[PDB]
Structure formats: C-alpha cells, structure tokens
Short mmCIF file of C-alpha atoms in Angstrom, two decimals:
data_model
loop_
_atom_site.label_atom_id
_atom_site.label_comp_id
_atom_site.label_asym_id
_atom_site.label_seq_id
_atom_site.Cartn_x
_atom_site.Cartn_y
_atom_site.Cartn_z
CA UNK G 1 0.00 0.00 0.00
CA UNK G 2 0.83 3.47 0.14
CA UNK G 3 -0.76 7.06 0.82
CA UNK G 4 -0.20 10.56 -0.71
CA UNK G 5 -1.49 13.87 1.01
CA UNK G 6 -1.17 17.51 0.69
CA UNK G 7 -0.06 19.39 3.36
CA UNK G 8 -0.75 23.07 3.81
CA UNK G 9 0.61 26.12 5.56
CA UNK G 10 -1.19 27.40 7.91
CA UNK G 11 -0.22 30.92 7.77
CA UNK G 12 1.87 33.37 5.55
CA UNK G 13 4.58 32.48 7.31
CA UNK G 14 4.64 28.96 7.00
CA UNK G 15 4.35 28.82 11.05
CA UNK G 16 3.43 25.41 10.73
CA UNK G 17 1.53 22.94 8.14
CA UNK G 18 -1.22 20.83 8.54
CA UNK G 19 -2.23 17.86 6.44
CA UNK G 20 -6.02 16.29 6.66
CA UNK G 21 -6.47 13.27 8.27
CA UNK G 22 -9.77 10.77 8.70
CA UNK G 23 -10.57 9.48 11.63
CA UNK G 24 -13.45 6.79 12.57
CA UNK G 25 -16.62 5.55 11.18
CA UNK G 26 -18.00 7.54 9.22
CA UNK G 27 -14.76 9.76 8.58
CA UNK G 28 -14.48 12.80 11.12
CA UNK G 29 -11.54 14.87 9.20
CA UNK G 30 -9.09 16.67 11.32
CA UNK G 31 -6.21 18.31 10.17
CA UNK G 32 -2.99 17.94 12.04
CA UNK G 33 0.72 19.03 12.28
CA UNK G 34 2.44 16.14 11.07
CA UNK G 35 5.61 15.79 13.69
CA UNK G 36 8.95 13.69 13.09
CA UNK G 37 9.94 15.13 16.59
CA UNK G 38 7.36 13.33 18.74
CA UNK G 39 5.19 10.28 18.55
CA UNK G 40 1.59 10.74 19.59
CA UNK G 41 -1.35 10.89 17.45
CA UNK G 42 -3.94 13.66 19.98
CA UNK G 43 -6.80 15.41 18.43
CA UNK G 44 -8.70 18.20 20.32
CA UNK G 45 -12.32 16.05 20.98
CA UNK G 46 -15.71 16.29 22.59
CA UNK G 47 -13.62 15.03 25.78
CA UNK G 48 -11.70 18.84 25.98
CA UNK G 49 -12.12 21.06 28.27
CA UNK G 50 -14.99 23.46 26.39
CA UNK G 51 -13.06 26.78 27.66
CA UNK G 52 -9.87 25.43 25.73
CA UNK G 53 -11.68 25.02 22.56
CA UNK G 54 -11.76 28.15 20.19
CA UNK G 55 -12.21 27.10 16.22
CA UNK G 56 -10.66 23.97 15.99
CA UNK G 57 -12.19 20.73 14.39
CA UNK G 58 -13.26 17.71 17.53
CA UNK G 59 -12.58 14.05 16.98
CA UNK G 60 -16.36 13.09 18.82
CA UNK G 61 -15.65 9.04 19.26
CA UNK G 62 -19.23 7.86 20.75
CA UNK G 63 -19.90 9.11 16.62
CA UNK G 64 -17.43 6.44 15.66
CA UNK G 65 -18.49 2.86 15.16
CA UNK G 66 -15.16 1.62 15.25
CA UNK G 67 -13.88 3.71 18.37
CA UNK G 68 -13.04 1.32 21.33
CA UNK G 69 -11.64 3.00 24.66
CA UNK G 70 -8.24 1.62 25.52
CA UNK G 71 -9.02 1.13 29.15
CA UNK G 72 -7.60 2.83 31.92
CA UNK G 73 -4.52 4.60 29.52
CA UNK G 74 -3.19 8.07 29.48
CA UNK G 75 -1.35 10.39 28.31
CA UNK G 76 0.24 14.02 28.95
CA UNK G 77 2.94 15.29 26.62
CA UNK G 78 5.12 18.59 27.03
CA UNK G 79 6.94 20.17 23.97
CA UNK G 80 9.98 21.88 23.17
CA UNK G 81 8.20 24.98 23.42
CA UNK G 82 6.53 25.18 26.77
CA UNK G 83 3.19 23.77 25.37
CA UNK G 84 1.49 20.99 26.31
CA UNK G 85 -1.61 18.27 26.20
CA UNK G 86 -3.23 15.22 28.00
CA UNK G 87 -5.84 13.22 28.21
CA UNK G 88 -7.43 9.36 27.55
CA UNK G 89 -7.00 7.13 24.55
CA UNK G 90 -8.94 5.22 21.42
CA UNK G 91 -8.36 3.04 19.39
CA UNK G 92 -9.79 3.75 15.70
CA UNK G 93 -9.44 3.68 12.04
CA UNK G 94 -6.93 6.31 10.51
CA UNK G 95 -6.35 6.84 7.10
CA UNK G 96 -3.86 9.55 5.64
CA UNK G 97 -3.60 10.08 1.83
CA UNK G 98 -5.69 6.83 0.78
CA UNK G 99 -3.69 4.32 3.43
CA UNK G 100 -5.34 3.08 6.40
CA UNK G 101 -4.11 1.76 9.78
CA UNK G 102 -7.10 -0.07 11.58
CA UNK G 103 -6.53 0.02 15.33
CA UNK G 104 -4.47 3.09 16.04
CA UNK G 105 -3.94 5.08 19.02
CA UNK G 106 -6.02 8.33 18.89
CA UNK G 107 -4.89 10.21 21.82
CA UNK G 108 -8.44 12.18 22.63
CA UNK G 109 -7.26 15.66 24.78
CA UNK G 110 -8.74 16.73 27.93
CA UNK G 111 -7.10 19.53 28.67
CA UNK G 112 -4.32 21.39 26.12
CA UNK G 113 -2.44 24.71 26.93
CA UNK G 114 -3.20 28.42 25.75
CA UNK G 115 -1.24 28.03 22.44
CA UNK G 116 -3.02 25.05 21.25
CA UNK G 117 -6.29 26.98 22.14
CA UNK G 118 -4.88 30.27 20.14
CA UNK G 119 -4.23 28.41 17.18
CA UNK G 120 -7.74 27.71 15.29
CA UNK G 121 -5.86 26.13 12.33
CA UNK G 122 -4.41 22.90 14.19
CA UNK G 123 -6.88 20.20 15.35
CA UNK G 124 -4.16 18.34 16.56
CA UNK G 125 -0.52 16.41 15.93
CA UNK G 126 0.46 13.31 14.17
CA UNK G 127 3.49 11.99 15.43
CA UNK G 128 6.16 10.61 13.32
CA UNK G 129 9.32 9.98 15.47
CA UNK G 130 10.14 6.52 17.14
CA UNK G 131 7.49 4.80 18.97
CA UNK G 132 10.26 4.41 21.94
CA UNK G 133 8.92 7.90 23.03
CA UNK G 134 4.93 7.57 22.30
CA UNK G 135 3.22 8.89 26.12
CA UNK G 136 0.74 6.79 26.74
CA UNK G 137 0.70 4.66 29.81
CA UNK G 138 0.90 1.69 31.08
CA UNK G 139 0.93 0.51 27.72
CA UNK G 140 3.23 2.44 25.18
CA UNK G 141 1.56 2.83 21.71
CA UNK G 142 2.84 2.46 18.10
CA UNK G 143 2.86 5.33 15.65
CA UNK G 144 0.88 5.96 12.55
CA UNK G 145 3.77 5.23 10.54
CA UNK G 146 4.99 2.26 12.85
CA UNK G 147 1.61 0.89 12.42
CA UNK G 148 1.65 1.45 8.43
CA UNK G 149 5.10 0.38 8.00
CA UNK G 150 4.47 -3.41 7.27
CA UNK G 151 2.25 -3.21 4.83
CA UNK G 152 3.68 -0.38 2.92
CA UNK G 153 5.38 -0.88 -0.71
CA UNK G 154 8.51 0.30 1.03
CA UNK G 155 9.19 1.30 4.54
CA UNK G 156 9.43 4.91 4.46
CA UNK G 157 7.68 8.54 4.15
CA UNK G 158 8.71 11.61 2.53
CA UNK G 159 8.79 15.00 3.39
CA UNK G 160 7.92 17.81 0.45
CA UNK G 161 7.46 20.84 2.44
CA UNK G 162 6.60 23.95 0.57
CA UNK G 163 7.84 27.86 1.04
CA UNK G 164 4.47 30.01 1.00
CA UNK G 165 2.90 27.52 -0.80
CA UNK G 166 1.39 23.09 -0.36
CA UNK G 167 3.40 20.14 -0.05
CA UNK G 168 3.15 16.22 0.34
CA UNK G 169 4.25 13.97 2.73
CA UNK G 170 4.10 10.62 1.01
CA UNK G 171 3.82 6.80 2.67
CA UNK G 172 5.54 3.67 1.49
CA UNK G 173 7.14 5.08 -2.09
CA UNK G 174 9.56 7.87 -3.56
CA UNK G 175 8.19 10.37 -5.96
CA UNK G 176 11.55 10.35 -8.36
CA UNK G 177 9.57 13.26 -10.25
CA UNK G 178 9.40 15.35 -6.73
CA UNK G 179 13.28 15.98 -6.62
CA UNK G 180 16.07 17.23 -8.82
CA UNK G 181 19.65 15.19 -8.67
CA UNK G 182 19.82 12.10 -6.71
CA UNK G 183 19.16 11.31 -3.11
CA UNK G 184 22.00 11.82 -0.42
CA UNK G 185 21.59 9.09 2.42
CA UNK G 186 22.99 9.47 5.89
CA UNK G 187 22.90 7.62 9.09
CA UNK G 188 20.43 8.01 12.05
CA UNK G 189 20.73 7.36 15.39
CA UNK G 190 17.43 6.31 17.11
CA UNK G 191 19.26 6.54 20.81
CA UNK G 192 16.97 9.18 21.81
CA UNK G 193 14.31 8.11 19.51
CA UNK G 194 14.50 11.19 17.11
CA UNK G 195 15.66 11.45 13.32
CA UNK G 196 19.14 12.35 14.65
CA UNK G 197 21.78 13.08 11.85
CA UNK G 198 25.15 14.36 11.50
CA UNK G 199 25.48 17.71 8.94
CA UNK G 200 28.79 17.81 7.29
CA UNK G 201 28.69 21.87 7.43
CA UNK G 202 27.21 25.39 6.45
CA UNK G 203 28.02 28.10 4.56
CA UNK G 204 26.91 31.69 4.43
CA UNK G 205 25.45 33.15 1.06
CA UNK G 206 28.65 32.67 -1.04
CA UNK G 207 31.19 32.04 1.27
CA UNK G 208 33.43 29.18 1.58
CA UNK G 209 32.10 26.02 3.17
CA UNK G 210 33.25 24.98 6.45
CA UNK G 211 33.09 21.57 7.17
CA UNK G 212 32.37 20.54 10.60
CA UNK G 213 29.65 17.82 12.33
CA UNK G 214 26.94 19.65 13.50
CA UNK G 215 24.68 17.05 15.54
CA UNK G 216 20.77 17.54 15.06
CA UNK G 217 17.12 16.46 14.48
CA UNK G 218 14.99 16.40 11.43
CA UNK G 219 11.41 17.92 12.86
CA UNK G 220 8.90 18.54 10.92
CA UNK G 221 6.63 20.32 14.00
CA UNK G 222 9.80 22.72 14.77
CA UNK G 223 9.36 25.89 12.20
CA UNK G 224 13.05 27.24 12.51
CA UNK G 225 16.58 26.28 12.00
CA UNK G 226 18.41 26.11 15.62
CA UNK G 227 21.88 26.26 15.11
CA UNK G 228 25.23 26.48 17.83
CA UNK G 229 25.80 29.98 18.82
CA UNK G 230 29.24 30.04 16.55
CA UNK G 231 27.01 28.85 13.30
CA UNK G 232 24.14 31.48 14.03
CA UNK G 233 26.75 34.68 14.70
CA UNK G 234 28.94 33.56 11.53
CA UNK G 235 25.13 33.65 9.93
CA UNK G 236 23.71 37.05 10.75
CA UNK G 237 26.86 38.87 10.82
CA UNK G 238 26.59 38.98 7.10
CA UNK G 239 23.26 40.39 7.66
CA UNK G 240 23.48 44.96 8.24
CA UNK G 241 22.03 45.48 11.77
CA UNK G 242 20.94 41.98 12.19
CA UNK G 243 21.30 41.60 16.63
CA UNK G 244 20.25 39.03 19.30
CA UNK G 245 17.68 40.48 21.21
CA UNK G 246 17.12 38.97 25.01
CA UNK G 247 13.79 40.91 25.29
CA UNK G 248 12.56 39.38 21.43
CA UNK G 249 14.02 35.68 22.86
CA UNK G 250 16.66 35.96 19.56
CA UNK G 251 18.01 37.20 16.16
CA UNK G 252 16.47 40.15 14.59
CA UNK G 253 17.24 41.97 11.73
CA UNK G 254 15.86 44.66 9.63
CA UNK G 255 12.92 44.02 7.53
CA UNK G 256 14.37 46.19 5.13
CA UNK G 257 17.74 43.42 4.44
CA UNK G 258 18.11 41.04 1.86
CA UNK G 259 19.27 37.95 3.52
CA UNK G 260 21.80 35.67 2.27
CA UNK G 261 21.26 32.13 2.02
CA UNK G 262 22.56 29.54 4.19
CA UNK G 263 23.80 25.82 2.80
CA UNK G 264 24.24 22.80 4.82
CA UNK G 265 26.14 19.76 4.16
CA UNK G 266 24.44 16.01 3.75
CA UNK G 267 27.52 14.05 3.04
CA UNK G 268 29.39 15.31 -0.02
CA UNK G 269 26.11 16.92 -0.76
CA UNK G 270 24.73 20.41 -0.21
CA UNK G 271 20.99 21.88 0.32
CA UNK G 272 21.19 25.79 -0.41
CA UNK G 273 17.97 27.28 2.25
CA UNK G 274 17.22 30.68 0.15
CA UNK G 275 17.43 33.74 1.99
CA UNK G 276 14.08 34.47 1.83
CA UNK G 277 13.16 31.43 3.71
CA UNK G 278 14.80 32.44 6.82
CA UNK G 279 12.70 36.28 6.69
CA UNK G 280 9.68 35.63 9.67
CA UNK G 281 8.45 38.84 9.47
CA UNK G 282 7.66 41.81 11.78
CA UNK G 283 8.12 40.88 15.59
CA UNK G 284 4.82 42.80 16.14
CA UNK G 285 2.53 43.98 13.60
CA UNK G 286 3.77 47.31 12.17
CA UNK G 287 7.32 46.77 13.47
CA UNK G 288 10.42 47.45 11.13
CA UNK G 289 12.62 44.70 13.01
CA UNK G 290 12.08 41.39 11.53
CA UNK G 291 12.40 38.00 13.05
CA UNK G 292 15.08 35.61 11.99
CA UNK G 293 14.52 32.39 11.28
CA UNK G 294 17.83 30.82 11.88
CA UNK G 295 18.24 31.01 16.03
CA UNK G 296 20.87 29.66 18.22
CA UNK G 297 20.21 26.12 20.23
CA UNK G 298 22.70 26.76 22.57
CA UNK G 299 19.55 26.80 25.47
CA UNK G 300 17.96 23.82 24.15
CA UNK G 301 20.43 20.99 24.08
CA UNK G 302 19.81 19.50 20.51
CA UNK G 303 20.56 21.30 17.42
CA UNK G 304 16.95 21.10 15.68
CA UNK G 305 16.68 21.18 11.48
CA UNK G 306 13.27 22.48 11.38
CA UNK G 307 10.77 23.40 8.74
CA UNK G 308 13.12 26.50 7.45
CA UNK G 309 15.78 23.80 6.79
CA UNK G 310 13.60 20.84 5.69
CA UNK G 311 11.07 23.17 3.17
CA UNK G 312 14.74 23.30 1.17
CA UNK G 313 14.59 19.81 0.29
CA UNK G 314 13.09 16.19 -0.25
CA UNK G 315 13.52 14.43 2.71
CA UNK G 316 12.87 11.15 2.84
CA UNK G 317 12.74 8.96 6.37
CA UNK G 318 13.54 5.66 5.87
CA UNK G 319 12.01 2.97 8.22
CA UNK G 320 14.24 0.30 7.22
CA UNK G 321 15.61 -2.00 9.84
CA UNK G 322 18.37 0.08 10.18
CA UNK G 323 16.72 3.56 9.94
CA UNK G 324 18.34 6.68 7.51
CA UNK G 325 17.42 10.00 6.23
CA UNK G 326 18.03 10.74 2.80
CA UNK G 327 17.93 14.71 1.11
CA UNK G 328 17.73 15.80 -2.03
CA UNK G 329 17.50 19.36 -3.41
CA UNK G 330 14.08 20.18 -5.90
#
C-alpha cells in the first residue's frame, strides 16, 4: 500500500503545516501538524475542556463505530516549546492520503495549553518519530507510521514541504519526479528516539564552506533552524544590523535586508535554504525589526533542522531496519 497527502501552511509564514487526516466511522476529518519530533497521534475532541476550545475541528468518538476506549490509559505530553496536552486514549481507524491503519492510538485531549487553544488552524498532531517515546501509559503505543510500516510498498515517508505555498508527505514510495539530482543518504541514530543526523557543514550566502559535524534532528513540527551559537553569529553577521535580542528571545534583523542564504552539508552533498526562507516577518505587527529564522540552540540541548531547513529539500525517512534520512534538493 501506500498514501499521498497535501499538506498546507497554515499561515503566511509557514508557522506550521497541517495535512487532513480521517478518523473513525463515518470519517471525522481533522487536520494535524504532522511531527517527526514526537510520537503521539492527539486530536482536540468532545472530551476537551470546552473553555480550551476556540475554532478547531473535535474528533467526537461515541460518533465512531469503530472507536473502542483503551481502558484505563493516558497520556500528557510537554513540547519543546513550553506547550502541552493530555488526556485518555482510542483506538480507531486512521487513514492519511488513501492508506489506512485499523486500530491506532487516537490520543483524545482533555485539557491542552493556551497556544493550542490560540491556534484555530491545528486540530491536533500526528506523530512521526520513534514509537520508543509515544506517552501513553501503562501501555506504550505504536505510531501511525509504525503501524503502516508493514504493509507499505517500502518502509518509508517523505517529506515535500513547501515555502508560501502546499506540499506532500508521502507513505511507502519515492516520488523520483518530486526531486532534482539524486538522493543523499545518511545515518540516524534512534538513541533518543528522534531522526538524529550528523550535517557535514554550512556556509553563508557565497562564502566558503566549512566543514564541521553539527549534531541535530529532522522535525517537521519545529518551524526554525536552531543552530550552535558560533554557526548562528557567523550567519547574521553577514546580515546589516541583524542583533540578538534577550527581550525578542533571539536574532532580529531589519525588515528592510536582503538575507543571504545559508547551505548545509548532507555528506558530499549540499541543500542551499534561500534567503528568503529564513525572513519571519515583523516581531509585532507594524514593526520594522524582523524575526530571523535561523536562532541559536545553545539553550535547548539539541541542534533542531526544522521546517526553514527541511522546506529546502526532499527528505525522505527511511524505516528500514536500520533507519536513515536521505535529502535531495528540488
């Protein structure tokens, strides 16, 4: 089998993209943020607290024929961003793109935290790291894509983000017309059950390339590039009146600048990120300063290639035995 959606931003910033999903019998479409940084599958629901629910689409499961309660399991997540969700759990059907998992964990929320409530656009997330770090207890639960993987053609997805504009993520095959060049495939390590890779290097606009192993995660659900400190100086130093600003929480720049673009190494490969990829926008409506979408990790403690970094190229997460990402420019 396989499955082919289109996934959307959800703003003119590209703050985030959503991609439909059905869920139960008869269908109940939600769209979610598709995440390769965590692994649950929660939908805001007719369980949620009603004061926490402002515009966004409810999973109802006493409408589903096939929703079963998965007695006496939880769940209660907390992201890299200081938001955060929990609740109970069903098991139901779940089809993405045309392929169906029967029996999948559908995380229902109880209560979710003020950002999820401000955002009208995102009904909930669909998880797509390693099932190693799926919430729900007693009894850990497999991802979509975990669940999906046997009976797919092959044993990945892909990852076709857009800039300003739709993309696909694809299940069990490679779209060879969705890429220019050929694939570059490098190794994963699953040890903290993330899409953890090794970049070869960066350079700035035209500048020379430096080669050195920069450590990080590919994450879909993240929208910006987070970088170490000496990366993300050497970066908007090229940039006229570009600053970190403790009171913004980072880099801003002038909305007025052309930003250069910023390549990173796969291998012996390269994906070039346009400038205007990493341009955010005003830091307040009206505002001349701009915010930068390249930012330092140095206070997280992973280096995270997010959707500024991923939107560059075809990515393609392969869930063979022994798990790799591939890239490709397009």
């Amino acid at each position: 089998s396989t499955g082919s959606a289109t996934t959307t931003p959800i703003d003119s910033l590209d703050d985030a993209y959503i991609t439909p999903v059905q869920i139960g019998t008869p269908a109940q479409t939600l769209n979610l943020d598709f995440d390769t940084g965590s692994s649950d599958l929660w939908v805001f629901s007719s369980e949620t607290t009603a004061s926490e629910v402002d515009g966004q689409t409810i999973y109802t499961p006493s409408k589903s024929t096939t929703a079963k309660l998965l007695s006496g399991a939880t769940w209660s997540i907390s992201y890299g961003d200081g938001s955060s969700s929990s609740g109970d759990v069903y098991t139901d059907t779940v089809s993405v793109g045309g392929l169906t998992v029967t029996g999948q964990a559908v995380e229902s929320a109880k209560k979710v935290s003020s950002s999820f409530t401000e955002d009208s656009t995102i009904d909930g997330l669909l998880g797509l790291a390693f099932s190693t770090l799926n919430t729900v207890s007693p009894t850990q639960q497999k991802t979509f894509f975990d669940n999906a993987k046997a009976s797919l053609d092959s044993p990945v997805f892909t990852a076709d983000l857009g800039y300003h504009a739709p993309g696909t993520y694809n299940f069990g095959f490679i779209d060879t017309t969705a890429y220019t060049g050929s694939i570059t495939y490098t190794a994963v390590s699953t040890k903290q059950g993330f899409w953890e890779w090794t970049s070869t290097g960066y350079a700035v606009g035209s500048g020379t390339f430096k080669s050195t192993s920069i450590d990080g995660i590919a994450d879909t659900g993240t929208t910006l590039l987070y970088l170490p400190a000496t990366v993300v100086s050497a970066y908007w130093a090229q940039v006229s009146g570009a600053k970190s600003s403790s009171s913004v929480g980072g880099y801003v720049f002038p909305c007025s600048a052309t930003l250069p673009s910023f390549t990173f190494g796969v291998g012996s490969a390269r994906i070039v990120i346009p400038g205007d990829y990493i341009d955010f926008g005003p830091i307040s409506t009206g505002s001349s300063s701009c915010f930068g979408g390249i930012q330092s990790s140095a206070g997280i403690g992973i280096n995270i290639f997010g959707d500024v970094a991923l939107k560059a190229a075809f990515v393609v997460f392969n869930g063979a035995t022994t798990p790799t990402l591939g890239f490709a420019s397009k």
